[PDB]
């Protein structure tokens, strides 16, 4: 295991299938993630981009898709508390696609949404999803990843 030493606290689990969950509880979980990363990061960078697994996004719509795009809901041009722009309708593809931007008022609190269902062929030749499908990953360019190549 080439463990890069990320804090164990950043590998979270919550149950969006549980009774009584709502859109704001789910966004609360995602912002728990955002807080932990802003606390733990060396640059303190705030996560702007979320990548959803297919099943995670399906659960997200299954639970919050009524509070989202409902009236009194987070997307209603007559109520000036938000500028969210998450689409009612999206393609389905074995790939990555951009579901829009889950923003607050003056750019505050925005969370670009991506869904990933791309698949790859495992060492055992089984096909598998690249992004863990039952999970959401928040990431930022502050990860400053290095692609490393040793001597041949």
């Amino acid at each position: 295991r080439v463990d890069f030493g990320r804090d164990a606290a950043l590998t979270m689990t919550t149950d969006w299938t549980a009774a009584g969950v709502t859109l704001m509880d789910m966004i609360a979980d995602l912002r728990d993630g955002q807080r932990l990363v802003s606390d733990k990061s060396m640059s303190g960078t705030v996560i702007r981009d979320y990548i959803f697994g297919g099943d995670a996004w399906d659960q997200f719509v299954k639970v919050g898709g009524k509070e989202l795009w409902g009236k009194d809901g987070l997307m209603d041009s007559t109520i000036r508390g938000s500028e969210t722009n998450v689409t009612r309708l999206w393609d389905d593809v074995e790939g990555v696609q951009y579901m829009g931007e889950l923003v607050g008022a003056n750019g505050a609190g925005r969370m670009r949404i991506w869904v990933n269902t791309q698949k790859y062929r495992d060492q055992n030749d089984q096909e598998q999803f690249l992004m863990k499908q039952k999970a959401v990953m928040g990431i930022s360019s502050a990860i400053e990843g290095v692609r490393c190549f040793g001597a041949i």
Binding site: F4, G5, C148, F149
Partner: peptide, 8 residues
């Protein structure tokens, strides 16, 4: 400190 050796 962190130290990493690439795979092959």
């Amino acid at each position: 400190t962190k130290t990493f050796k690439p795979a092959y």
